[PDB]
């Protein structure tokens with residue numbers, strides 16, 4: 188049995204914990220927040236700030252198989268970079284790739300440098316997209332791009348520095364706030380796969396990255412990369428393709444990775460609002476919760492409950508095809524109806 192240490196216990200931390208458990212690993216969580224969202228989901232919880240007390244994390248490294256940063260606190264990531272040679276196990280992160288991916292303008296310069304199409308900068312006609320809002324005087328540093336209509340599509344890539352494993356396409360379902368409330372799998376797209384390969388190869392990526400593109404009216408446009416363990420999509424990747432991104436990332440830092448199921452999966456967040464009206468919500472709502480863990484499971488159905496000001500449910504449905512998965516979704520909703528008096 189292997190043991191993984193997660194630095195960060197919110198949304199990324201949940202995803203990494205969830206897949207670590209699927210792989211049969213013990214999950215050790217480090218988080219500075221004593222009320223960290225997934226404190227009760229992890230197998231062990233150590234409450235400290237890694238920047239203030241590095242020796243405690245270094246000591247943990249002696250007794251786990253890997254340390255995975257799962258936060259986007261720049262102070263934390265940059266400090267971890269500065270002490271990474273002192274660790275007694277792999278640190279499953281690409282610090283140079285993160286320095287590029289975190290900065291949207293630097294990412295766009297990177298895309299252009301390798302000929303990857305991306306939305307036009309500072310356009311002259313509306314609509315504009317600004318970063319998240321559509322516009323029909325902001326800080327001098329705001330990204331202004333053309334608004335590209337169409338499907339938002341995600342691909343994860345795991346690299347070992349030499350080989351780049353492009354995994355599974357997913358559809359990012361967006362709400363009125365441009366947050367993601369649902370994820371479903373998509374058929375292979377040879378163009379998007381090659382672009383994602385090249386984005387990883389040219390870094391060169393040793394670690395994990397996701398690539399998001401919009402399938403626009405004038406073709407595919409890459410909108411961002413994020414070189415950190417994602418939320419939401421890895422669960423859909425797991426059921427639809429059989430690949431566990433935690434296992435693949437761990438392999439990239441041990442024996443290496445090789446290039447290249449066909450099930451369906453529906454993943455979504457639902458809030459139980461005023462007098463049990465069921466409302467779709469984005470990730471951002473879930474991150475304001477106080478406690479997050481497993482609520483229910485049967486064949487083809489997992490439900491997680493995120494407690495707080497109005498309970499939020501994360502629903503995971505799978506099956507051999509769209510039809511069987513739709514059937515499980517209906518069953519999962521009725522589990523909420525008969526139990527709680529929920530409407531949808």
Ligand SMILES: Nc1ncnc2c1ncn2[C@@H]1O[C@H](COP(=O)(O)OP(=O)(O)OP(=O)(O)O)[C@@H](O)[C@H]1O
Nearest residue numbers: 195196197218219220235236237238258259260263
């Ligand atoms: N130096 C650190 N040591 C330990 N845990 C940390 C550190 N920095 C961040 N974290 C934890 O990682 C989790 C995710 O942090 P992140 O900054 O990515 O998300 P956030 O939504 O901006 O959270 P916050 O409310 O802290 O701003 C949080 O639970 C946070 O407490």
Ligand SMILES: Nc1ncnc2c1ncn2[C@@H]1O[C@H](COP(=O)(O)OP(=O)(O)O)[C@@H](O)[C@H]1O
Nearest residue numbers: 306316319332333334335336339361365410411
């Ligand atoms: N240029 C664009 N044109 C149209 N929609 C966009 C554009 N950029 C972003 N979006 C929309 O805004 C959402 C969030 O943008 P994203 O670049 O993915 O930010 P983040 O780094 O915050 O996740 C996207 O999922 C997409 O729905």
Ligand SMILES: NCCC[C@@H](N)C(=O)NCCCC[C@H](N)C(=O)O
Nearest residue numbers: 197198199259341397417418419420
């Ligand atoms: N592959 C497409 C994924 C986009 C979105 N699902 C995401 O990963 N968001 C991560 C937000 C995490 C915020 C914060 N660092 C936290 O961990 O809570």
Ligand SMILES: [Mg+2]
Nearest residue numbers: 399410411413
């Ligand atoms: Mg994005």
Ligand SMILES: [Mg+2]
Nearest residue numbers: 399411412413
């Ligand atoms: Mg992003």
